[PDB]
Design a protein around this ligand. Structure first.
Ligand SMILES: CC(=O)N[C@H]1[C@@H](OP(=O)(O)OP(=O)(O)OC[C@H]2O[C@@H](n3ccc(=O)[nH]c3=O)[C@H](O)[C@@H]2O)O[C@H](CO)[C@@H](O)[C@@H]1O
Ligand SMILES: CC(=O)N[C@H]1[C@@H](OP(=O)(O)OP(=O)(O)OC[C@H]2O[C@@H](n3ccc(=O)[nH]c3=O)[C@H](O)[C@@H]2O)O[C@H](CO)[C@@H](O)[C@@H]1O
Ligand SMILES: CC(=O)N[C@H]1[C@@H](OP(=O)(O)OP(=O)(O)OC[C@H]2O[C@@H](n3ccc(=O)[nH]c3=O)[C@H](O)[C@@H]2O)O[C@H](CO)[C@@H](O)[C@@H]1O
Ligand SMILES: CC(=O)N[C@H]1[C@@H](OP(=O)(O)OP(=O)(O)OC[C@H]2O[C@@H](n3ccc(=O)[nH]c3=O)[C@H](O)[C@@H]2O)O[C@H](CO)[C@@H](O)[C@@H]1O
Lengths: 416, 416, 416, 416
């Protein structure tokens, strides 16, 4: 089956345009279900996960059309409020329709997400918030059912600043009676994008991007036009590629405010970075300095760039420590890095990376979206040729990584 | 030597006035060193740790006077910029003079804190920030020396939102040339209190209480009058006491905004809480509901209330899980809770608390400030009598816990 | 694709015959490569992993024939000493040919195992032992190469009592010049089975089953007949099934000495167990008592029964704690147990299981061999019907689990 | 108060005689309580912990006399079976009288050990074994009471191969009616010493030093003469001192079988070691090679040498990883190593040691017995002078460390 073949490449040089954020667009597409009218989303990345959540909206009866990075949704005449097992199993972000469906029809039944490549990921905090708003919760044979005679705004505390729980609860709160306060909210940039979209539809959401979000419920929302933010994780991926290949890349159509920790840590590794209004230039160092990273809730270092930074560290000039505080099992890629000649030892949530002279091409498998991109970055610097399998992991969340890297001078080909 | 004797007590009832915050006043006292004039701090708690940092200020040549909860400092004529081993060993918050001394004299030499009761606690992030501002760092026989021809504002990223590092770097930045940006700053309420004090002295600090702090350096600061915020951890301690004893306590002179996670989790345990402008009323439930807690950076659940909430959980109606993400070894109290008949099992950063019918009085030792207060709370509900040793841990950070609990109806006595 | 459908079943009752051990037979099949003649293995289970290692032996030029639970190998005329990427990727126990091939031809080149469902699993200790015996190690593009002018016996210490490293090093040592001592050896029963087979072929291996193994090298080994031990993990699986279903099962063709920790913990859970010479009877309790388990090197509780014991605990009368010390990520099944209505929370290497009234059938996926068997056990007690996917995980390591459970009265069917 | 002053020293050279094992002699002294007559223990080290357990025996009514490394105990006329809070608080190994007292009088009441410097250390497995033998357990105000009409031999499984639980249960089993089997027993050398002593008194204990111990109860035991084994941890301490100081030390009156993991890892670090019948010679390398260690049950690497090996690693030529699997919080010394200029970072149970050019003398505090000895080893190689406080930690478990190191050429003095 399909492989990505990467060869030892030239230093990456040139400009790369970043697509719209996968992780902004998925909750914002769920949010269109809140409105009795037609929404228009611009800057939608042409990814399989976008087309899966689109098909879940079609399943509940919304009208969806996609063309040329625009998606329109008419949620005027939703029929059903069930998310079946197949669609949640395909893409767990499907779970983000639970808040809007509960808000629009006072009842929803959603398949409970199972195992995930990067850890055991409960959705207890989503349910905690729905219960706080007056929903009764019950489990039926793998489905979670939430129902109320009416949502009522309430204060609620998140035990962890969950991105998904913050999104799901903000969307349910947008149509509730009265004021909801989310304490210890996720501060991720996608939370601010979703809030901005809710407000464009007529909502009253304040404090997004801060540790406390206040939602004053409205009776009805209306479809609106929205420009999705750029993908800060895709941007980070190309910035690391510049660092690893001693390259010089200008990343275009980005927001520097969303990239702070990645810029800081790349500068600590020895990159020369020039931040501009709509773009950032990264010049890789001749010798990578070893750095430590610790993944944390935004604006701490993002777990979605952990595997890629770990890849950079495999050839750094000394010992780096990677601590993963956000996910339990997000080290499955380590054994694949080790096949390419890395020196990585893990215990608990920490991985000790002892820099080596160079990596050596090998047959490797992508284990998840971000680790697969990290294996491409390894392949760009590994002596010889690297063959990456299980490439659906990569292709679901990166637009045309082969064409983008090819335009920067790299040697990469997808083969079927 | 000295003991605290607690007996099985009546439900606590009445009002308790909360003192000024230990953890606001210690950095704010360090901050007085920045000013060439006289500062006046009101609402200073009469604690030994306040008198130790006072003696460190005297050692470097400030004029200090304490009376009736007011402390004045005249830092006009500081002489020396060394913090000796004895004073840092007595109280590691002594380390907070490093930023002001570096800012005022471009050189400082500070004993590096050693072992702490609650974990291995490096000060690497403090030094990272000082280096970012242009200080050269070197180690001399247990001392860390920082020196520059001049501090220059710079952007810097905290790998962890360290309270102390945020404080130390904000104070050094206040006199630097140009603008400092602290990314992934601590959002704790004491950070906002310190910033407000710096601004009263003439500084330019914005974003305190948010994930990013911008400091625009000034050439000179002037002594100012400051009212310290209330102790949110002392307040929380009395709120838990009300929960555990099925009592009804009004906690006076508090700020509800600073107590959000404790209020939320006590309500989840079944407390009836009434939040007012300057006070909160807590009515304990008849049956405590088991809850989980996870300690996190503010506004997540505070590690300084973890031992006390764990004590409440020892008699809850089921199984609670306590996860400590902020400190490594903050479970030393568990073996003392177990001596009183608790059922607590730990592995890694998690403690599983299986609620028991009641605790039984025993001889126990305080291991640290907050655990010792937790043993007092255990003693209030434990059948018979509890004798707590190593009471200096408690007395250093709580004003008159014996008199406050006695005024609420509890049976407690300090014996020498 | 293929599913296993399990329905709420009757209490399991009757007798089940246990097959030969997967984990004894795989190293013993590798061991046949040491001998210049024909070996005969009896009691070989008819499993896909047996047929994969058989095809690796064919690849290096051994003559292999399988019929009716007997496998014969003639290794007289081995040609090649390379284990290609495809075969190691299919089954990482392929790595166990490295010791015999190095011993027979003084050179071998073996694909380095990559990611595994249950964790990052390095083979550093195997290489440590080969280096101790005088092999030079080098990495070529995902392959590990070991070569020497001659193996020489030496003392070596295992940092962890690795099963695989103990096996690989014992087999390499069997033909080395002089005496090898393995300190901190694996004490697992399969180590004793392998040693017994090596000695039947003419080797000199003493102390297998103890913490120290001494091998006195011989010049040549000869094919021998060997009876493989029973599968203690399959036996344990049926013993747990009896516990969970309040059944009464006699497990036949087992060795009680190999089952000590499972017998002890099932008795602690309330089972009535009768140990006999060749069989054990398990009578499940009416109410399961909650127990804790901690996985450890033999004779501690086996990690290969952790998922199954966790499944039993999901309906126990209280709170059980499962600690996994042997593998890093062996909790991937938890999210699937939770889909069936379990109450399991994980942090680090510990899982807190809060017993529920009953499980509810759901669509679930096997994540690995032992977890998939655990989902079958869940399915036997879950209200309604359970549909298990990704069933190749199960079928590779269990002989006819559908027929065995059907003969005990359970409702189970494999559908294609 | 008292300090140990260590200066940068010459390479240690010469011979050092090792004392009798602290951890053999403490359970063997408890074991004398089993016998209705007079025991004679030779090779008893002149340590405070020996004199504390001696005073506990006096408290229950045994006749005890100590002179010149011989201790005699006449337990003929024991009166009482209570171990009071003061004595267990002074030394938790006091808990080892519980098994003998329960065996001799069918009742005992023992203060439950509280907090320990190196972790939360429950005694649940001791009680599990006593319950298995037919004792009823209950808690009274910090005391654990065990009582039976008669002990009856039974099979029992240790969830962890606890040294103390193995000792306590073996001693209780020695007078029980019938056969006790301890499954997953501690294999530590002190377990074999205790068993040998029990058998000298008339017991029937087989399998000590293996993973299974069988005790056939007898009606009465008689006092006996016993030679205690050498202290393998003291020996290891001097062997590390030779490694760290590039010295050449012959350690006399030792058993090489008890030192296997320490010898192996020191050889891996580059030491030249010559093992003899009663002694071992260690020649330190010119350059220490970095090694990893992982603490495990014997015969894995001992946790009691972890701090000392960590100290050696602080100046090794690269990165070493220390994993502590046996105790939770056994890293309290790291902050003291860091005061001396080490580069150690911890997360969870792992410490990453990045070797430095040299350590620098500083004021440091001993946190526990073995860490304090490790600070002496640091002090021997640290530039300048080191002053160690809280020296009672060291003095309680090492005989005349000042005189022994002085006789090997080191510069060390105890000052009062
Ligand atoms: C579609 C999308 O935007 N996906 C992203 C989103 O995931 P997602 O929204 O799932 O991530 P969360 O922030 O919820 O998860 C963070 C942690 O919280 C835990 N948790 C979460 C929810 C809950 O109810 N209970 C609970 O315990 C999770 O197991 C995890 O350990 O943020 C992650 C963290 O930056 C990214 O890696 C994902 O790619
Ligand atoms: C005087 C004062 O206000 N004390 C409080 C302050 O401590 P303090 O300011 O020491 O606490 P931090 O927020 O710095 O520590 C949090 C974590 O960060 C780590 N860290 C910190 C600094 C650094 O340079 N590197 C590093 O790794 C620490 O080891 C710890 O694990 O906040 C803590 C967390 O709410 C409280 O428990 C303390 O009582
Ligand atoms: C074919 C076979 O018999 N498989 C079994 C064998 O696996 P296997 O022989 O792989 O298991 P090991 O005992 O080697 O692994 C135990 C632990 O040691 C670690 N380790 C191992 C080797 C090494 O060189 N370095 C290292 O760090 C592993 O990552 C793991 O965490 O024993 C396991 C433990 O009972 C079982 O679950 C497997 O089903
Ligand atoms: C007097 C003596 O000989 N002391 C030694 C003995 O301690 P001790 O006998 O206390 O050590 P154990 O082997 O019992 O402890 C090992 C681990 O098991 C745990 N555990 C132990 C008992 C129990 O009932 N439940 C439980 O969970 C402990 O918390 C610890 O994490 O062996 C230790 C391990 O080599 C050494 O460091 C000690 O110096």
């Amino acid at each position: 089956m399909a492989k990505i073949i990467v060869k030892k490449s030239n230093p990456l040089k040139g400009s790369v345009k970043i697509d719209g954020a996968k992780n902004a667009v998925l909750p914002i597409i769920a949010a269109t279900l809140l409105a009795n009218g037609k929404s228009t989303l611009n800057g939608v990345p042409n990814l399989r996960d976008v087309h899966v959540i689109s098909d879940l909206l079609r399943h509940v009866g919304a009208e969806v059309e996609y063309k040329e990075n625009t998606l329109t949704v008419d949620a005027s005449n939703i029929k059903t409020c069930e998310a079946p097992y197949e669609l949640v199993r395909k893409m767990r972000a499907s779970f983000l329709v639970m808040g809007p469906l509960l808000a629009r029809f006072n009842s929803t039944k959603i398949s409970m997400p199972g195992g995930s490549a990067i850890g055991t990921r409960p959705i207890d905090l989503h349910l905690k918030g729905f219960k706080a708003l007056g929903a009764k919760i019950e489990m039926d044979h793998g489905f979670v059912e939430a129902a109320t005679e009416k949502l009522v705004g309430n204060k609620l505390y998140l035990d962890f600043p969950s991105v998904g729980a913050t999104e799901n609860i903000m969307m349910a709160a947008s149509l509730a009676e009265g004021t909801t306060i989310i304490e210890n909210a996720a501060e991720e940039p996608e939370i601010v994008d979703l809030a901005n979209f809710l407000n464009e539809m007529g909502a009253d959401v304040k404090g997004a991007g801060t540790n406390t979000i206040k939602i004053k419920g409205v009776k009805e929302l209306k479809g609106a036009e929205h420009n999705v933010i750029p993908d800060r994780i895709e941007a980070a991926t190309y910035m690391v590629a510049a660092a690893m290949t001693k390259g010089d890349i200008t990343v275009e159509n980005v927001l520097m405010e969303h990239l702070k920790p990645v810029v800081a840590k790349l500068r600590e590794a020895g990159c020369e970075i020039t931040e501009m209004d709509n773009s950032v230039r990264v010049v890789g160092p001749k010798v990578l300095k070893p750095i430590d990273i610790k993944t944390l809730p935004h604006p701490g270092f993002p777990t979605d760039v952990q595997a890629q930074f770990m890849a950079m560290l495999t050839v750094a000039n000394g010992t780096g420590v990677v601590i993963e505080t956000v996910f339990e099992n997000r080290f499955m890629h380590v054994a694949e890095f080790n096949r390419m000649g890395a020196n990585i030892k893990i215990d608990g949530r920490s991985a000790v990376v002892n820099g080596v002279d160079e990596l050596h091409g090998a047959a490797v498998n992508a284990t998840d979206l971000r680790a697969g991109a990290a294996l491409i970055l390894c392949g760009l610097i590994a002596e010889g040729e690297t063959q990456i399998g299980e490439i659906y992991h990569i292709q679901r969340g990166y637009v045309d990584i082969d064409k983008k890297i090819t335009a920067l001078g790299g040697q990469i080909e997808i083969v079927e």
